[PDB]
Amino acid sequence: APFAIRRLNAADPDFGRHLDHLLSWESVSDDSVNQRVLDIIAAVRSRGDAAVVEFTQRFDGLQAASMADLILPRERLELALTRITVAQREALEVAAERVRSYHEKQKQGSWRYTEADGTVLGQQVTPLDRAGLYVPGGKASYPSSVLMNAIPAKVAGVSEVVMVVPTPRGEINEIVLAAACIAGVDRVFTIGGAQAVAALAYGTESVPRVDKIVGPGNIYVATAKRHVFGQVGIDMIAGPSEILVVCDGQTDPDWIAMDLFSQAEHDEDAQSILVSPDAAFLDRVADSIARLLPTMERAEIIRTSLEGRGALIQVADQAQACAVANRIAPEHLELSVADPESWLPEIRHAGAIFMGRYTAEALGDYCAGPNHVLPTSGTARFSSPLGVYDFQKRSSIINCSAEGASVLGRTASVLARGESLTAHARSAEYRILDEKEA
Amino acid sequence: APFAIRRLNAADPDFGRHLDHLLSWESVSDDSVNQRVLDIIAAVRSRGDAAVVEFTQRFDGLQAASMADLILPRERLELALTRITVAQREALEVAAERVRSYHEKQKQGSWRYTEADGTVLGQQVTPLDRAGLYVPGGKASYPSSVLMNAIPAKVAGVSEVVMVVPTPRGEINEIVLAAACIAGVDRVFTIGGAQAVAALAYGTESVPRVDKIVGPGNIYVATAKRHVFGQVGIDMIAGPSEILVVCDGQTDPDWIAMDLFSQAEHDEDAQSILVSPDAAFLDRVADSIARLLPTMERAEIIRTSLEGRGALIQVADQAQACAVANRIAPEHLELSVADPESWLPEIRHAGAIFMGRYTAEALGDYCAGPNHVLPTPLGVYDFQKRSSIINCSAEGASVLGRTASVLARGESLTAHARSAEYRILDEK
Numbered sequence: 089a090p091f092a093i094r095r096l097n098a099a100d101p102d103f104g105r106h107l108d109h110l111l112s113w114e115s116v117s118d119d120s121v122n123q124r125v126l127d128i129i130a131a132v133r134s135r136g137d138a139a140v141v142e143f144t145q146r147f148d149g150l151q152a153a154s155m156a157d158l159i160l161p162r163e164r165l166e167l168a169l170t171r172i173t174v175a176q177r178e179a180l181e182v183a184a185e186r187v188r189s190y191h192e193k194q195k196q197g198s199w200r201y202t203e204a205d206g207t208v209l210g211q212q213v214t215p216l217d218r219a220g221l222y223v224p225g226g227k228a229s230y231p232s233s234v235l236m237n238a239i240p241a242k243v244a245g246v247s248e249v250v251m252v253v254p255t256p257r258g259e260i261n262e263i264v265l266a267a268a269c270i271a272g273v274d275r276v277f278t279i280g281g282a283q284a285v286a287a288l289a290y291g292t293e294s295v296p297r298v299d300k301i302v303g304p305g306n307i308y309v310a311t312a313k314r315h316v317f318g319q320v321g322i323d324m325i326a327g328p329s330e331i332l333v334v335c336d337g338q339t340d341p342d343w344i345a346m347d348l349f350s351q352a353e354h355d356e357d358a359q360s361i362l363v364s365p366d367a368a369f370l371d372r373v374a375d376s377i378a379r380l381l382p383t384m385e386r387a388e389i390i391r392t393s394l395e396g397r398g399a400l401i402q403v404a405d406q407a408q409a410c411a412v413a414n415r416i417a418p419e420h421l422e423l424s425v426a427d428p429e430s431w432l433p434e435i436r437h438a439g440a441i442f443m444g445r446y447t448a449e450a451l452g453d454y455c456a457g458p459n460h461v462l463p464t465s466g467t468a469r470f471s472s473p474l475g476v477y478d479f480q481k482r483s484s485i486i487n488c489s490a491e492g493a494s495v496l497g498r499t500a501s502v503l504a505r506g507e508s509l510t511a512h513a514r515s516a517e518y519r520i521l522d523e524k525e526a
Numbered sequence: 527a528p529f530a531i532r533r534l535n536a537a538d539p540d541f542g543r544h545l546d547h548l549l550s551w552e553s554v555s556d557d558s559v560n561q562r563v564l565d566i567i568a569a570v571r572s573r574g575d576a577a578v579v580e581f582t583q584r585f586d587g588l589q590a591a592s593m594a595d596l597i598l599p600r601e602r603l604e605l606a607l608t609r610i611t612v613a614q615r616e617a618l619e620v621a622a623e624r625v626r627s628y629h630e631k632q633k634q635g636s637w638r639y640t641e642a643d644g645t646v647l648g649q650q651v652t653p654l655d656r657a658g659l660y661v662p663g664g665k666a667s668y669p670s671s672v673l674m675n676a677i678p679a680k681v682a683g684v685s686e687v688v689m690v691v692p693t694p695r696g697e698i699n700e701i702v703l704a705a706a707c708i709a710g711v712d713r714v715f716t717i718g719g720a721q722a723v724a725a726l727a728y729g730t731e732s733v734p735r736v737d738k739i740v741g742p743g744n745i746y747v748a749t750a751k752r753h754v755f756g757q758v759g760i761d762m763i764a765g766p767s768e769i770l771v772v773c774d775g776q777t778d779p780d781w782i783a784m785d786l787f788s789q790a791e792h793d794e795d796a797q798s799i800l801v802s803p804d805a806a807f808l809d810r811v812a813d814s815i816a817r818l819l820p821t822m823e824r825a826e827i828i829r830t831s832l833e834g835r836g837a838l839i840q841v842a843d844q845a846q847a848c849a850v851a852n853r854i855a856p857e858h859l860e861l862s863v864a865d866p867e868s869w870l871p872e873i874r875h876a877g878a879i880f881m882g883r884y885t886a887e888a889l890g891d892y893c894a895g896p897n898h899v900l901p902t903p904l905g906v907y908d909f910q911k912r913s914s915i916i917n918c919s920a921e922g923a924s925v926l927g928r929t930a931s932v933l934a935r936g937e938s939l940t941a942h943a944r945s946a947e948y949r950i951l952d953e954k
């Protein structure tokens with residue numbers, strides 16, 4: 089039996105609820121994951137290294153007695169570099185070059201500016217002492233995620249960049265370790281899930297407490313990241329793995345099927361949805377999916393995710409396509425249409441957007457990591473708090489001259505007195521100067 | 527009778543334990559506040575306006591028949607601008623011009639760049655629909671906080687900026703309301719605490735759900751902000767009112783005492799600490815504190831703050847002074863020394879820094895506005911939403927797909943590889 093992708097129609101009256109169920113249902117159960125994540129964090133906070141080794145054994149299926157078996161030295165990273173092919177080393181280095189060159193152009197440092205009255209203003213910019221990189225490794229390996237977060241941290245000057253990556257059944261991915269070596273990662277712990285997030289956020293006897301945790305992850309990593317919010321810095325919690333492809337029917341249906349396959353091969357909980365007003369095109373995408381799926385090397389993962397969350401949605405016209413897209417509110421939108429800048433005005437709820445027939449998630453995954461912008465010299469001219477800025481701390485500076493204090497204190501005194509904050513007022517008035525006073 | 531500020535010495539072998547306790551000591555356990563904040567949030571989502579009114583009555587001591595009695599029309603803001611003094615209005619208007627001028631120059635919109643191979647990259651920038659601004663009630667409320675938060679949101683194009691400010695026992699701060707008029711606040715609700723944050727984060731019948739919540743508040747506001755993170759954008763959790771003054775001993779001791787008093791007078795949980803290598807200077811500040819405290823209108827709040835969290839700390843030298851400062855990680859640091867740029871490199875864990883003998887933390891609370899120079903991402907930027915755009919040409923996808931395909935195949939992510947490979951062109 090040829091796999092039959094789930095078909096939906098915005099004309100059918102049950103579309104509203106049928107769509108709401110596809111986006112909402114959860115097999116892992118909510119509050120269930122939340123409770124287990126809360127329990128894991130409390131354990132690592134109390135029992136420390138012992139808890140992480142036990143959780144690593146239970147959840148990752150590992151056979152390690154001490155924390156030391158879960159710590160990879162820098163030499164193990166350099167050795168991984170030698171165990172990968174030449175094509176894979178250069179591909180890692182080519183990606184590293186573009187990432188590193190971009191972040192070097194965006195790095196901003198400390199500055200001072202002297203006003204007319206002598207007052208000095210500015211910012212002190214210092215790198216965070218410690219940054220923690222979560223690299224997902226549960227159901228696949230993601231080396232580009234290492235480069236995307238470790239390189240801007242090193243460019244910022246973060247002295248210690250620590251990486252956690254789960255090694256299921258003790259299997260070690262040399263391409264991911266080789267990326268860590270090229271990216272300048274200092275230490276690699278072979279742990280994952282909520283226990284690894286806990287170990288970096290609070291610290292164990294063997295895992296250092298970091299200033300910021302970054303990286304994508306599954307429901308446990310995402311849930312653990314929102315809990316440690318406040319205790320430790322975090323980038324952005326990433327929602328469930330999804331792609332929404334919106335096509336006008338003029339893209340090769342195999343490309344669209346493979347684009348949906350690419351998100352689907354991530355994990356069995358992945359959500360791949362296609363929306364199009366072209367009915368005959370949607371039939372071809374179904375024919376493309378059935379033909380192409382069996383040969384796929386991860387056809388079991390793809391079939392599972394498509395069954396659970398995949399959908400081919402028919403809409404009446406471009407306007408309905410955009411309405412369905414705004415309901416779905418995708419973090420990643422593939423605008424596979426001829427006039428994609430003409431569809432964007434009516435698409436208000438979407439994070440990263442791939443536009444046209446030649447761009448898909450695979451390019452975003454491997455070549456566009458920071459804020460989902462592609463690192464080039466031209467894109468560098470446009471500043472971002474993401475990337476190098478996020479691995480830096482900025483302290484504002486004010487150094488008043490005697491005169492500058494005098495003019496500022498007059499204004500401060502008026503407002504502070506009006507608010508009965510007399511200590512504010514008097515500390516400012518102490519510095520007001522009148523040359524006629526002897 | 528005379529107040530005696532707590533004294534610690536880094537020459538004492540046990541100093542670290544006392545400093546750890548000074549920085550960790552809390553009056554109301556964070557778990558006690560946590561449960562209260564979580565239950566309030568749950569109650570606001572469940573019962574909407576009804577919960578907001580009940581909590582306003584309990585915590586603000588304000589009889590209110592309906593949610594309608596807690597909504598302040600924008601015309602009341604225009605009235606407030608009428609009731610303040612000439613000097614206060616010009617101080618607010620002059621600061622507002624500098625804040626507004628600054629953010630107008632810093633604003634960035636949507637952009638596109640076309641690479642040499644035809645690939646287009648860029649960002650589609652859209653103003654947030656609604657922003658919520660928290661402003662503490664009563665007199666201990668900086669109007670500069672209203673100007674600094676509502677003005678960049680308006681410059682960004684946020685259509686509805688909503689202020690929440692509790693009116694304890696029905697008391698209004700006309701300077702604060704006037705600053706909201708100048709700043710372009712569209713609507714005001716006289717509510718506060720965790721229930722105000724919860725109402726903005728999720729929406730009630732009368733309180734609109736906003737996209738981002740900003741502004742300073744005590745532990746209940748900050749804890750509510752931590753818990754609503756995810757449902758709504760937030761600025762920073764914001765720490766407790768705190769000042770660390772580091773002095774070489776050559777600043778007027780009355781000035782240092784007043785600088786400590788100014789932070790301590792915000793609320794009873796404020797923390798004011800002085801560190802110096804000059805033991806006689808610390809005795810002079812200690813005497814200044816005792817003499818000056820009874821002259822202060824908010825002496826009762828200051829005393830409670832200094833007793834709970836205040837300290838004067840002696841150290842050996844600049845190096846130890848800087849070491850202690852780095853451990854305290856002060857949200858506000860006053861480097862009251864001769865060469866402040868020489869101390870700062872050793873104090874990297876501090877927040878905003880006030881340098882020299884002529885710069886008090888009170889100047890930060892009453893910012894008279896930036897200038898033409900502070901330009902060259904925390905103002906207009908944080909009231910915009912950004913969408914990254916990658917529009918590869920055929921050739922651009924070919925260059926990028928070559929690198930992506932190798933790594934994806936290396937990790938056996940074959941759908942990724944084939945998806946990229948469909949767009950790779952054969953070379954000449």
Ligand SMILES: NC(=O)C1=CN([C@@H]2O[C@H](COP(=O)(O)OP(=O)(O)OC[C@H]3O[C@@H](n4cnc5c(N)ncnc54)[C@H](O)[C@@H]3O)[C@@H](O)[C@H]2O)C=CC1
Binds near residue numbers: 223282
């Ligand atoms: N560009 C991007 O944003 C990318 C996003 N992703 C997405 O992040 C996710 C990665 O997930 P995985 O492959 O599984 O690796 P992962 O590292 O995110 O999760 C594996 C960890 O989950 C924990 N875990 C597994 N079962 C558990 C259970 N019953 N109870 C408690 N903990 C458990 C384990 O500690 C395990 O180490 C995927 O959904 C992927 O689509 C992947 C890489 C990059």
Ligand SMILES: [Zn+2]
Binds near residue numbers: 351450
């Ligand atoms: Zn992917």
Ligand SMILES: [Zn+2]
Binds near residue numbers: 420440460
């Ligand atoms: Zn993403």
Ligand SMILES: [Zn+2]
Binds near residue numbers: 890
């Ligand atoms: Zn501050």
